[PDB]
Amino acid sequence: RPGGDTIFGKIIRKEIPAKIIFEDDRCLAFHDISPQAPTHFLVIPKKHISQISVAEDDDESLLGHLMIVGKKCAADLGLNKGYRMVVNEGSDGGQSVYHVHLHVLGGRQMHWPPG
Amino acid sequence: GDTIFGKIIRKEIPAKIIFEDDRCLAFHDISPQAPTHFLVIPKKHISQISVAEDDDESLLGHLMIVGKKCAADLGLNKGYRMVVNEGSDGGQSVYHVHLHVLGGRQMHWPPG
Ligand SMILES: Nc1nc2c(ncn2[C@@H]2O[C@H](COC(=O)NCc3ccccc3)[C@@H](O)[C@H]2O)c(=O)[nH]1
Numbered sequence: 515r516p517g518g519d520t521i522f523g524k525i526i527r528k529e530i531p532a533k534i535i536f537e538d539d540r541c542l543a544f545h546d547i548s549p550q551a552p553t554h555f556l557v558i559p560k561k562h563i564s565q566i567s568v569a570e571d572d573d574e575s576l577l578g579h580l581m582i583v584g585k586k587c588a589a590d591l592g593l594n595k596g597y598r599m600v601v602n603e604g605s606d607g608g609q610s611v612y613h614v615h616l617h618v619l620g621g622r623q624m625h626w627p628p629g
Numbered sequence: 630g631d632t633i634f635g636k637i638i639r640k641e642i643p644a645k646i647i648f649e650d651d652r653c654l655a656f657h658d659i660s661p662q663a664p665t666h667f668l669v670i671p672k673k674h675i676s677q678i679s680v681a682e683d684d685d686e687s688l689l690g691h692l693m694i695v696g697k698k699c700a701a702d703l704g705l706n707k708g709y710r711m712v713v714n715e716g717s718d719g720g721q722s723v724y725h726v727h728l729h730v731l732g733g734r735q736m737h738w739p740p741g
């Protein structure tokens with residue numbers, strides 16, 4: 515099954531419901547079920563890549579597309595004071611789902627350090 | 630307007646450079662928030678991610694690929710966190726797009 519069987523692969527194939535913000539042939543943006551800010555969504559590739567550390571050189575356009583879609587969705591959601599984009603890698607990064615994903619958080623002041 | 634990151638790209642002030650190519654520069658953060666904390670920045674002056682153009686897509690992805698390669702070279706085998714801040718709520722400190730890469734300790738949740 516295209517996208518794999520992580521929760522995110524299931525969401526891509528409409529097998530598990532999600533609150534979808536934007537969808538194209540390359541990616542999907544949807545709200546996080548455990549939000550850490552008043553607005554907290556995810557942008558994921560439809561292609562399954564387990565983690566950023568194994569992304570290939572030719573994935574550059576796709577990874578950049580996640581950011582472009584993320585910033586467009588943030589504007590569409592009225593995050594006019596800004597937002598934070600996060601990619602978690604591995605154990606120290608706090609990655610819990612091994613399908614690459616970009617978090618976008620806003621609607622409150624984000625603090626430093628970022629975790 | 631120019632920023633301190635422009636000065637770093639132009640080699641006018643020092644930074645501990647990790648990697649450079651024709652289109653980006655990676656260097657250690659002067660105010661590190663983890664045992665390893667570096668930045669990957671485009672040489673093109675994009676002020677913030679909110680104004681990035683569609684044609685910049687692959688350049689933005691290039692920052693992430695460079696970041697992950699630098700992280701491996703710096704020994705971050707247990708993982709790391711990549712961050713882009715936008716605007717005041719995002720805590721963006723310099724108005725030149727930059728990818729933070731942090732590791733060498735457990736990163737926590739929420740991410741700020
Ligand atoms: N809509 C929807 N979102 C989901 C679902 N199952 C998971 N998620 C979200 O995926 C993200 C994965 O994040 C990471 O990999 N690291 C962040 C993290 C997570 C836990 C503890 C510490 C850090 C998390 O923020 C989840 O809330 C789902 O069924 N539906």
Ligand SMILES: [Cl-]
Pocket residue numbers: 714720721722723
């Ligand atoms: Cl910043």
